[PDB]
Design a protein around this ligand. Structure first.
Ligand SMILES: [Mg+2]
Ligand SMILES: [Mg+2]
Ligand SMILES: [Mg+2]
Ligand SMILES: [Mg+2]
Ligand SMILES: [Mg+2]
Ligand SMILES: [Mg+2]
Ligand SMILES: [Mg+2]
Ligand SMILES: [Mg+2]
Ligand SMILES: [Mg+2]
Ligand SMILES: [Mg+2]
Ligand SMILES: [Mg+2]
Ligand SMILES: [Mg+2]
Ligand SMILES: [Mg+2]
Ligand SMILES: [Mg+2]
Ligand SMILES: [Mg+2]
Ligand SMILES: [Mg+2]
Ligand SMILES: [Mg+2]
Ligand SMILES: [Mg+2]
Ligand SMILES: [Mg+2]
Ligand SMILES: [Mg+2]
Ligand SMILES: [Mg+2]
Ligand SMILES: [Mg+2]
Ligand SMILES: [Mg+2]
Ligand SMILES: [Mg+2]
Ligand SMILES: [Mg+2]
Ligand SMILES: [Mg+2]
Ligand SMILES: [Mg+2]
Ligand SMILES: [Mg+2]
Ligand SMILES: [Mg+2]
Ligand SMILES: [Mg+2]
Ligand SMILES: [Mg+2]
Ligand SMILES: [Mg+2]
Ligand SMILES: [Mg+2]
Ligand SMILES: [Mg+2]
Ligand SMILES: [Mg+2]
Ligand SMILES: [Mg+2]
Ligand SMILES: [Mg+2]
Ligand SMILES: [Mg+2]
Ligand SMILES: [Mg+2]
Ligand SMILES: [Mg+2]
Ligand SMILES: [Mg+2]
Ligand SMILES: [Mg+2]
Ligand SMILES: [Mg+2]
Ligand SMILES: [Mg+2]
Ligand code: NA
Lengths: 50, 75, 136, 116, 58, 94, 69
RNA sequence: UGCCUGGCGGCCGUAGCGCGGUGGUCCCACCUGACCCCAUGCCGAACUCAGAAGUGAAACGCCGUAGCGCCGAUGGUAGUGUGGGGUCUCCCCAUGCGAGAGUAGGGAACUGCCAGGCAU
RNA sequence: GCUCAACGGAUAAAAGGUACUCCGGGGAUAACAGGCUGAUACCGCCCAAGAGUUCAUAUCGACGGCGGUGUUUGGCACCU
RNA sequence: UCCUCCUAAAGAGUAACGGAGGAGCACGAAGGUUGGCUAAUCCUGGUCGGACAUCAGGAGGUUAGUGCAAUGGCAUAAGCC
RNA sequence: CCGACUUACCAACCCGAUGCAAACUGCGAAUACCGGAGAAUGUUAUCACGGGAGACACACGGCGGGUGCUAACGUCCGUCGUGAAGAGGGAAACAACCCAGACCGCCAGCUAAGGUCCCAAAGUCAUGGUUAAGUGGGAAACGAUGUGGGAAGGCCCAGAC
């Protein structure tokens, strides 16, 4: 539908990322979650990307 | 117009009363909780009742609502 | 011509007609017309029999119809192949088992009731009999 | 009813503890007279108990039904439990908030030695 | 100890699979074949299952 | 004052009761009080001619079973679905 | 069979026969009686008077001189 | 040991509801006060705390009452596995299983652990 | 990154006509005729409201019911 | 193509151009947890206000709700804050 | 404004009674299925893994159904049987129905279904009854002092029909 797949990139130096979806029409603010980074093995902030 | 149906889901009781199961064995596949988890029985996200221990399947109607529970007798 | 208002579904399976009836007693009147045989009563047959009764007895007396067709019968149009979906609902039948009281009558002598029930049974596809209300 | 509201408020944790097979320290609060029991995993028989309706406890409290009385009951029940050998219990609010007298009882039980 | 003689009096051709399995469990092969079996409730239940085609003498 | 002769049923159930009603009797039961229920057979012609009176269902009846006279009352009657026949009668004692 | 709120043909006053049609169709048109020949005797009908009268007075290609539609 | 009460269970309507009566030493409940612990998308209603003067009004418990709910035979009936039969999309016979409903009736729960009070 | 939705997706990429037709087959399957059936068709009977100046049944017969035949159109696809 | 019910003969499965309906998503909260709460619909009373708004009480009992079909669930709520 | 009248009409809820349901269920079988134990029986009949297939047009009959018209030697499922791929006997003849599974031979015997007057093997068998219709040896609603049996009932040697 109108939900676009976005990429949450780790704020650590790792190129690690999760992928999710987002309704950019209703929520135009970036996702700023705190997910587990398996490269550094810590919970760091993942920020939305493309 | 008609003509559509769904693939059958193969629900229902897999292991019946008195049957010896291993831990993790699926006992009943259901939509809601027709059967409720008793002792040593877990309920999955799709409400699948599974054995959390090795033992025998046991059905009861305990409770104030007379609902049916499945437990694993650790035998 | 009796017919249900706003049923759940338009069409139903053929089903069977095994078993004995349930409403086998004269519950509302003094006399009744009970089905000895098994079959289908269409709404047209029920209405014909009711008119025969209501004319044989004059405006006097009360008449109960104990049966409702409540079952749609479909037919395919003529010159249509087999298949292409179930046919269209043409009429409604009541399923009748042996013993079903079909009509009851009250407020008339038994002789008038008998001749009215005969006039009406002549309109029905089912073998009938005359019954009276029994104490217990 | 406040009683029925509280019992349905407690039912979930009670059934969870019964499922876990835990020995439970059940508290019961009343405007006067807080109560505590330690009940076996089978839930049908009491292992230990302590309350301000007991004279040996109430004799040392100027009011039974306050935080100090609750702390006294908590210390007493945890002492009796540790003497019977019951160390690892689970707390059962019985539908009361874990805020005042109930929290005082639970804290007193913790400092006395009951692990929960 | 107590035995019972069972003869097959009818054919097994168009019989139910369970009936043919019962005749096998009794040991009956032919029509007119007579076996001698132990007189236990299980044997009696087999004889009951296929009574329409076996004859019993005790 | 209705009197009905009856024998006790030796065999009971579906096939036995059907054999009875074919042999022109019909089963009946007597119950009530502390005495156990008593299964009896009635002559269908006799009882069908008797029950045609509306007082059969109000008066206290008597049933002669094994010589014993049991005062009863017609409690329930199972009639044939469409035939003018009786299938079963319940008699409450006294 | 209905003509008006007061005029309906009893459906037995209407003779309907089956015949073979003209034109294309092959063996099926040769052998099959798909064409309908409807005959309706106006005088022998239970049609209203003045309806019988107008039908018998009309000069229509579908009404024969014997008073048959 | 008895009675009463509180808590936690078993059991899940023979156990619930209604109707009537009844209990306040203790317990319980309402209750009193609230700036505080804490609380109200407003409110000390609730939740919470500090208490206990008053009342058992309500609630709750107990005791009666069947007006209901509920339980419920026996017998019969329905259905039905197997074999057989007929007049055969419905039945019957032999045998085995045998309801549901209803009827007679039952029925105002029973019980375990702990604690407290009173009487002993 | 695929209404690859004909959704196990044959290509990245594809509509028609043939009575000018052709081949391999099929009675696996239509058109004729036969068969089974009898919805339809046609014929008969039952009930009898009524019409018939009265009068159901001289004649006709509503609302309904039960059959027969195997002329129609069909259904099926058993033969070819 | 997928989902729900029935057909489907009380395990599973089960066909038809059989009978009925939906999906091709939504949601960073509509997820997690903790704490708390319990509906529909009526009646009575009440400014505008009304069949129907909000308030109070009673009855009622989940006849509601479950982001979207249907089914099975759901009060310990899976429903509501 | 207001309002007794005309509510003799319809009529919700509720109460009492009567039914109906594939897509209703406060009930609920028989069977079937799953599991465990125990005999007896069965040439392991079971499973696994390997070599080789063929087959994936099914038919009819019974039972449970959908569809069709409670049509079809119809169609579509479930399940069993048979045919397919099974000869023999019976049903006149008649894959699929009934009985019954052909290793070969015999101018031996007993039986199954079905039969026993003649064709044509075997009862012109025995006992009791029914039917006159050649019913048996096709059919419905409905009609009828056909005839047999049964249970009552009305009126009747103060005389019934
Ligand atoms: Mg399905
Ligand atoms: Mg102790
Ligand atoms: Mg056979
Ligand atoms: Mg039987
Ligand atoms: Mg052309
Ligand atoms: Mg032709
Ligand atoms: Mg004419
Ligand atoms: Mg006081
Ligand atoms: Mg009071
Ligand atoms: Mg019984
Ligand atoms: Mg019962
Ligand atoms: Mg896509
Ligand atoms: Mg494709
Ligand atoms: Mg495909
Ligand atoms: Mg492809
Ligand atoms: Mg060619
Ligand atoms: Mg063909
Ligand atoms: Mg061929
Ligand atoms: Mg043809
Ligand atoms: Mg006239
Ligand atoms: Mg033809
Ligand atoms: Mg075919
Ligand atoms: Mg030919
Ligand atoms: Mg199933
Ligand atoms: Mg099944
Ligand atoms: Mg949610
Ligand atoms: Mg919560
Ligand atoms: Mg008002
Ligand atoms: Mg059902
Ligand atoms: Mg193929
Ligand atoms: Mg195929
Ligand atoms: Mg069938
Ligand atoms: Mg075929
Ligand atoms: Mg076929
Ligand atoms: Mg072949
Ligand atoms: Mg053969
Ligand atoms: Mg042959
Ligand atoms: Mg023949
Ligand atoms: Mg021959
Ligand atoms: Mg052989
Ligand atoms: Mg013989
Ligand atoms: Mg001879
Ligand atoms: Mg002779
Ligand atoms: Mg003849
Ligand atoms: Na009764």
């Amino acid at each position: 539908g109108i939900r676009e797949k976005i990429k949450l990139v780790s704020s650590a130096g790792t190129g690690h990322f999760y992928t999710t979806t987002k309704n950019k029409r209703t929520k135009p603010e970036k996702l700023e979650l705190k997910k587990f980074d398996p490269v550094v093995r810590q919970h760091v902030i993942y920020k939305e990307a493309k | 117009r008609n003509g559509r149906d769904s693939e059958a889901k193969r629900l229902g009781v897999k292991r019946f009363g008195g049957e010896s199961v291993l831990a993790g064995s699926i006992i009943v596949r259901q939509r809601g909780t027709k059967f409720h988890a008793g002792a040593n029985v877990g309920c999955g996200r799709d409400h699948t009742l599974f054995a959390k221990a090795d033992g025998k399947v046991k059905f009861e109607v305990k409770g104030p609502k007379n609902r049916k529970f499945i437990s694993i007798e650790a035998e | 011509m009796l017919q249900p208002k706003r049923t759940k579904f338009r069409k139903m399976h053929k089903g069977r007609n095994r078993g004995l009836a349930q409403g086998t007693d004269v519950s509302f009147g003094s006399f009744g017309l009970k089905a000895v045989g098994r079959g289908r009563l269409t709404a047209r047959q029920i209405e014909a029999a009711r008119r025969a009764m209501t004319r044989a007895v004059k405006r006097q007396g009360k008449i109960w119809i104990r049966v409702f067709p409540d079952k749609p019968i479909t037919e395919k149009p003529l010159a249509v192949r087999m298949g292409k979906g179930k046919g269209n609902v043409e009429y409604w039948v009541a399923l009748i088992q042996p013993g079903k009281v079909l009509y009851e009558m009250d407020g008339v002598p038994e002789e008038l009731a008998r001749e009215a029930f005969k006039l009406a049974a002549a309109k029905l596809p089912i073998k009938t009999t005359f019954v009276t209300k029994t104490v217990m | 009813d406040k009683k029925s509201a509280r019992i349905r408020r407690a039912t979930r944790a009670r059934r969870k503890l019964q499922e876990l097979g835990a020995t439970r320290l059940v508290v019961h609060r009343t405007p006067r007279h807080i109560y505590a029991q330690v009940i076996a995993p089978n839930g049908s028989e009491v292992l230990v108990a302590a309350s301000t309706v007991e004279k040996a406890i109430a004799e040392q409290l100027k009011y039974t039904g306050n935080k100090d009385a609750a702390a006294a009951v908590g210390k007493a029940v945890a002492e009796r439990a540790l003497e019977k050998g019951i160390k690892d219990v689970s707390f059962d609010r019985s539908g009361f908030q874990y805020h005042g007298r109930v929290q005082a009882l639970a804290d007193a039980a913790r400092e006395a030695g009951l692990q929960f | 100890a107590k035995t019972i003689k069972i003869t097959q009096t009818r054919s097994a051709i168009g019989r139910l699979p369970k009936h043919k399995a019962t005749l096998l469990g009794l040991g009956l092969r032919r029509i007119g074949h007579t076996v001698e079996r132990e007189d236990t409730p299980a044997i009696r239940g087999m004889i009951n299952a296929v009574s329409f085609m076996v004859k019993v003498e005790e | 004052m209705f009197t009905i002769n009856a024998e006790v049923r030796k065999e009971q159930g579906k096939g036995a009761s059907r054999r009875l009603r074919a042999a022109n009797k019909f089963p009946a039961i007597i119950y009530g009080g502390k005495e156990a229920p008593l299964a009896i057979e009635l002559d269908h012609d006799k009882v069908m001619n008797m029950q045609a009176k509306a007082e059969f269902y109000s008066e206290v009846l008597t049933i002669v079973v094994d010589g014993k006279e049991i005062k009863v009352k017609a409690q329930d009657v199972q009639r044939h679905p469409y035939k003018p026949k009786l299938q079963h009668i319940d008699f409450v004692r006294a | 069979i209905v003509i008006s709120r007061h005029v309906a043909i009893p459906d037995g006053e209407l003779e309907i026969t089956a015949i073979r049609a003209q034109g294309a169709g092959g063996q099926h048109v040769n052998k099959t009686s798909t064409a309908i020949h409807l005959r309706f005797d106006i005088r022998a009908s239970s049609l209203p008077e003045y309806y019988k009268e107008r039908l018998l007075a009309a000069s229509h290609h579908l009404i024969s001189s014997d008073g048959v539609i």
